[PDB]
Design an enzyme around this catalytic site. Structure first.
Site, short mmCIF file in Angstrom:
data_model
loop_
_atom_site.label_atom_id
_atom_site.label_comp_id
_atom_site.label_asym_id
_atom_site.label_seq_id
_atom_site.Cartn_x
_atom_site.Cartn_y
_atom_site.Cartn_z
N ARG A 1 0.83 -1.19 0.00
CA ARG A 1 0.00 0.00 0.00
C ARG A 1 0.88 1.26 0.00
NH1 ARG A 1 -3.00 2.68 4.99
NH2 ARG A 1 -4.23 4.28 3.89
N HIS B 1 0.69 4.21 -2.70
CA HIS B 1 0.33 5.58 -2.35
C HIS B 1 1.42 6.60 -2.64
CE1 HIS B 1 -3.50 5.22 0.28
NE2 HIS B 1 -3.46 4.25 -0.62
N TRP C 1 -10.39 -8.71 2.66
CA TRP C 1 -11.05 -9.03 1.40
C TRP C 1 -11.09 -10.54 1.20
CZ3 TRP C 1 -7.67 -4.90 1.86
CH2 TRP C 1 -8.15 -3.64 1.46
C1 FMI Z 1 -1.51 -2.21 -6.47
C2 FMI Z 1 -1.95 -1.91 -5.11
C3 FMI Z 1 -3.15 -1.30 -4.73
C4 FMI Z 1 -3.97 -0.50 -5.45
C5 FMI Z 1 -3.81 -0.04 -6.91
C6 FMI Z 1 -5.03 -0.07 -4.58
C7 FMI Z 1 -6.06 0.79 -4.94
C8 FMI Z 1 -7.03 1.34 -4.11
N1 FMI Z 1 -7.14 1.10 -2.74
FE1 FMI Z 1 -6.06 -0.29 -1.72
N2 FMI Z 1 -4.75 -1.37 -0.59
C9 FMI Z 1 -3.68 -2.11 -1.04
C10 FMI Z 1 -3.19 -2.10 -2.33
C11 FMI Z 1 -3.70 -1.36 -3.39
N3 FMI Z 1 -4.82 -0.55 -3.30
C12 FMI Z 1 -3.22 -2.99 0.01
C13 FMI Z 1 -2.13 -4.06 -0.13
C14 FMI Z 1 -3.94 -2.70 1.12
C15 FMI Z 1 -3.84 -3.36 2.51
C16 FMI Z 1 -3.03 -2.51 3.48
C17 FMI Z 1 -2.95 -3.10 4.88
O1 FMI Z 1 -3.46 -4.22 5.11
O2 FMI Z 1 -2.36 -2.43 5.76
C18 FMI Z 1 -4.85 -1.64 0.76
C19 FMI Z 1 -5.77 -1.07 1.63
C20 FMI Z 1 -6.76 -0.16 1.27
C21 FMI Z 1 -7.71 0.42 2.19
C22 FMI Z 1 -7.71 0.24 3.68
C23 FMI Z 1 -6.65 1.05 4.40
C24 FMI Z 1 -6.68 0.81 5.89
O3 FMI Z 1 -7.77 0.96 6.48
O4 FMI Z 1 -5.63 0.48 6.47
C25 FMI Z 1 -8.57 1.16 1.46
C26 FMI Z 1 -9.77 1.95 1.99
C27 FMI Z 1 -8.12 1.11 0.09
C28 FMI Z 1 -8.68 1.83 -0.95
C29 FMI Z 1 -8.22 1.85 -2.27
C30 FMI Z 1 -8.70 2.74 -3.41
C31 FMI Z 1 -10.09 2.15 -3.79
C32 FMI Z 1 -8.83 4.14 -2.75
C33 FMI Z 1 -7.36 4.63 -2.68
C34 FMI Z 1 -7.96 2.33 -4.55
O5 FMI Z 1 -8.20 3.13 -5.62
N4 FMI Z 1 -7.01 0.30 0.00
#
Ligand code: FMI
Length: 294
Positions: free
Chosen positions: A48, A52, A191
């Site tokens: 993530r 970002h 998920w």
């Molecule tokens: C290629 C990678 C990737 C893409 C492109 C991508 C795209 C997009 N993500 Fe996602 N992401 C990734 C990888 C990727 N994400 C991962 C691995 C996580 C898990 C993080 C964790 O478990 O700490 C998370 C966690 C997370 C969370 C929860 C954060 C938290 O509460 O800790 C949200 C709400 C969103 C929203 C969104 C979008 C929809 C809004 C920005 C979106 O467009 N993400």
């Protein structure tokens, strides 16, 4: 105001072996600090973080992006969209201390590549050369996407990152990793079941689980399944839109295809905005700890 060109500049005298050592240090720490986030480990948050720090890019003027490593600056690390990523930055601190010669952008992006590979995901070719830029080059907050929108919002948003439908759907497959944390994003739940193993589970769950639109404790809507999984409104939009749906089905039925497409899209995401000289080194493909017998 004219768009600046960011030319990749290899850290002085460094080569593949130097970066494999950094990869290894990151990989070894991922193994050591296994208790994080109820034993999910730091893999997901590092992915993530890599995303970002790259997702702020604007193809129109080449601002933002992974090149400058600007997340190290207050304005960006305090972006509400980045809540929780401080855990990933803290994880990388001892790594950067040991290898002070690596740029911040190279470290942030390499952290994501290392995490994906160590979690049994596809190999992600990676190129060095990002150079730290001044604090005034830090992009303003609000460039990262929202999760409460629909398929149309997602499609339009990602055009700014020069990603098409297939690229968007492939990138979202990374949500097979980790979970949403109410305190960070206003969403709660994983998920899928294999939280720290990179597979195409995201697509399988979207298609096979019985989803119900509910309100979480933050008063935000999200899709929940009896299995204990959730999907963001944007995740669910991937099966509501007919074009996205076709691709979701494709990846749910072809693990190799998903791995190959994700690898290309993820490298592209991490390289957006960077100009690589014709004689720059070819992309590096790092060996996993497992492949090295480490
Ligand atoms: C290629 C990678 C990737 C893409 C492109 C991508 C795209 C997009 N993500 Fe996602 N992401 C990734 C990888 C990727 N994400 C991962 C691995 C996580 C898990 C993080 C964790 O478990 O700490 C998370 C966690 C997370 C969370 C929860 C954060 C938290 O509460 O800790 C949200 C709400 C969103 C929203 C969104 C979008 C929809 C809004 C920005 C979106 O467009 N993400």
């Amino acid at each position: 105001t004219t768009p600046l060109v960011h030319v990749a500049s290899v850290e002085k005298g460094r080569s593949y072996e130097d970066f494999q050592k950094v990869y290894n240090a990151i990989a070894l720490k991922l193994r050591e600090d296994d208790e994080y986030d109820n034993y999910i480990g730091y893999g997901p948050v590092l992915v993530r973080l890599a995303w970002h720090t790259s997702g702020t890019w604007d193809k129109h003027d080449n601002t933002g992006g992974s090149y400058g490593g600007t997340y190290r600056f207050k304005k960006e690390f305090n972006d509400p969209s980045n809540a929780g990523l401080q855990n990933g930055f803290k994880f990388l601190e001892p790594i950067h201390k040991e290898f002070p010669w690596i740029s911040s952008g190279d470290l942030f992006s390499l952290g994501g590549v290392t995490a994906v590979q160590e979690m049994q995901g596809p190999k992600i070719p990676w190129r060095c050369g990002r150079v730290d830029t001044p604090e005034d080059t830090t992009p303003d907050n609000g460039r990262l996407p929202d999760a409460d929108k629909d398929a149309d919002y997602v499609r339009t948003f990602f055009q700014r990152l020069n990603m098409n439908d297939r690229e968007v759907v492939a990138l979202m497959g990374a949500h097979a990793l980790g979970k949403t944390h109410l305190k960070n994003s206003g969403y709660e739940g994983p998920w899928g079941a294999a939280n720290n193993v990179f597979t195409n589970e995201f697509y399988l769950n979207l298609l096979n689980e019985d989803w119900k639109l509910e309100k979480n404790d933050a008063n935000n809507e999200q899709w929940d399944s009896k299995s204990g999984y959730m999907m963001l409104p944007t995740d669910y939009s991937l099966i509501q839109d007919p074009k996205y749906l076709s691709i979701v089905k494709e990846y749910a039925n072809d693990q190799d295809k998903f791995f190959k497409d994700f690898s290309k899209a993820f490298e592209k995401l991490l390289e957006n905005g960077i100009t690589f000289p014709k004689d720059a080194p070819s992309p590096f493909i790092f060996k996993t700890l497992e492949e090295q017998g480490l």
